[PDB]
């Protein structure tokens, strides 16, 4: 577990080569220059690693019960294998938002910090926002916060292009807004029908 | 006997259960023991089970309920953890718990009033769950989040009403958010005082 305070020019972390059942890793990056491109990189422990709002982070953990989060920014997470976390601190905007690459079973989403308006779903909230054979990715984001978030945060999903999308309606009106509205892609066809969602955490089913 | 239980006070163990009966005669009144169960940072869990409170009648044995304090070490600590994270009651008067690792309540037979009080930790608590399994309940008065009011509550209240009907005359938690209704057996809740509510779900049989 290393405190890295202040290490701000830090663009490599690169812990991947460590070896145990638990020898786990715990970073956070100091990095504070605008559109970085830092690599945060887990060993085999169940790693806790973060990265900087600032940056564009591709975070890779090992084996094990990684957590990676995201504080914003154009991030890319992959939790390699093992009940990996996607800890999703920040709203993000509509560009600057976190892929997470190799979304399996068992992995989970933890959406408590995106709870803008109380608390999300608590059921297994799982039949996927379906729309036509030319449906764009701003007419699916629009059509997924349609609803009303103002007093309660809700959670939609769907599939675009070949990867799926989870979506935070934080907002009035059918306007995905890019500010406080949160978008989430995950690489690849991925079914969250069967999925539910823990408190705030989702788990993959 | 008629002549009433004397007090029952535990201190310290890894997990508590006060069980009470009563066995006087079919036209006598006996008033149950007073509890009082002080937990070490070993408690875990605390039980304390009573015979079912009846009026004095002619062929209908009497019994009153005594009250029961749990209290867990950390209860007035500002900083330290706190360990009574369930505790179950079967039947009770005055009821009080208070400890800030608490997450289940397990309710049972005849109730006067249930007050929770969760530690006077000076942190902001993240994971703000009751879950209230229900039972053959009833209640003469309240169950109250004592928390909510000047300091940091339950924001979701789960209710799982099981086996048999249960009746609340009174839920009052004004830091409360969500509420969902589950289970098995009727769960009937004569008036809540739960201004800041955001929505109420039933999923109950
Ligand atoms: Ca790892
Ligand atoms: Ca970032
Ligand atoms: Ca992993
Ligand atoms: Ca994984
Ligand atoms: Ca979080
Ligand atoms: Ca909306
Ligand atoms: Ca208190
Ligand atoms: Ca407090
Ligand atoms: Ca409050």
């Given at each position: 577990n290393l405190t890295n305070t202040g290490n701000t020019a830090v663009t490599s972390f690169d812990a991947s080569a460590v070896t145990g059942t638990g020898s786990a890793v715990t970073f956070v990056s100091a990095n504070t220059t605008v559109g970085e491109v830092v690599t945060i990189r887990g060993g085999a422990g169940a790693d806790s690693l973060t990265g900087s709002a600032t940056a564009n982070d591709t975070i890779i953990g090992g084996a094990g019960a990684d957590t990676l989060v995201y504080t914003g920014g154009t991030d890319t997470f992959t939790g390699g294998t093992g009940a990996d976390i996607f800890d999703i601190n920040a709203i993000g905007t509509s560009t600057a938002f976190v892929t997470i690459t190799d979304a399996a079973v068992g992995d989970k989403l933890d959406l408590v910090g995106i709870?803008?308006?109380?608390?999300?779903?608590?059921?297994?909230?799982?039949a996927a926002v379906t729309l036509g054979a030319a449906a764009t990715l701003a007419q699916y984001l629009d059509a997924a916060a349609?609803?009303?978030?103002?007093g309660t945060s809700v959670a939609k999903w769907f599939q675009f292009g070949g990867d799926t999308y989870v979506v935070v309606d934080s907002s009035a009106g059918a306007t995905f807004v890019s500010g406080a509205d949160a978008v989430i892609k995950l690489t690849?066809?991925?079914?969250?029908?069967?999925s539910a969602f823990a408190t705030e955490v989702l788990t993959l089913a | 006997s008629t002549t009433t239980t004397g007090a029952i006070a535990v201190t310290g163990g890894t997990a508590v259960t006060v069980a009470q009966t009563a066995g006087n005669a079919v036209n006598t009144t006996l008033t149950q023991a007073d509890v009082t169960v002080t937990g070490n940072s070993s408690t875990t869990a605390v039980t304390v089970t009573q015979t079912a409170a009846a009026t004095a009648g002619a062929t209908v044995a009497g019994r009153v309920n005594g009250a029961v304090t749990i209290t867990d070490s950390?209860?007035?600590?500002?900083?330290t953890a706190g360990k009574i994270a369930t505790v179950t009651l079967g039947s009770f008067g005055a009821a009080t718990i208070d400890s800030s690792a608490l997450t289940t309540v397990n309710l049972s037979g005849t109730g006067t009033s249930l007050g929770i009080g969760r530690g006077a930790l000076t942190a902001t608590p993240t994971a703000n769950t009751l879950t209230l399994n229900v039972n053959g309940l009833t209640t003469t008065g309240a169950i109250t989040?004592?928390?909510?009011?000047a300091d940091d509550g339950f924001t979701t209240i789960n209710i799982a009403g099981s086996t048999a009907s249960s009746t609340i005359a009174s839920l009052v938690a004004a830091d409360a958010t969500t509420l969902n209704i589950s289970g098995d057996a009727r769960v009937t809740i004569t008036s809540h005082t739960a201004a800041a509510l955001t929505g109420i779900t039933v999923t109950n049989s």
């Open positions: 709870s803008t308006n109380g608390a999300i779903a608590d059921g297994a909230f799982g349609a609803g009303d978030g103002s690849g066809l991925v079914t969250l029908t069967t | 950390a209860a007035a600590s500002a900083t989040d004592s928390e909510a009011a």
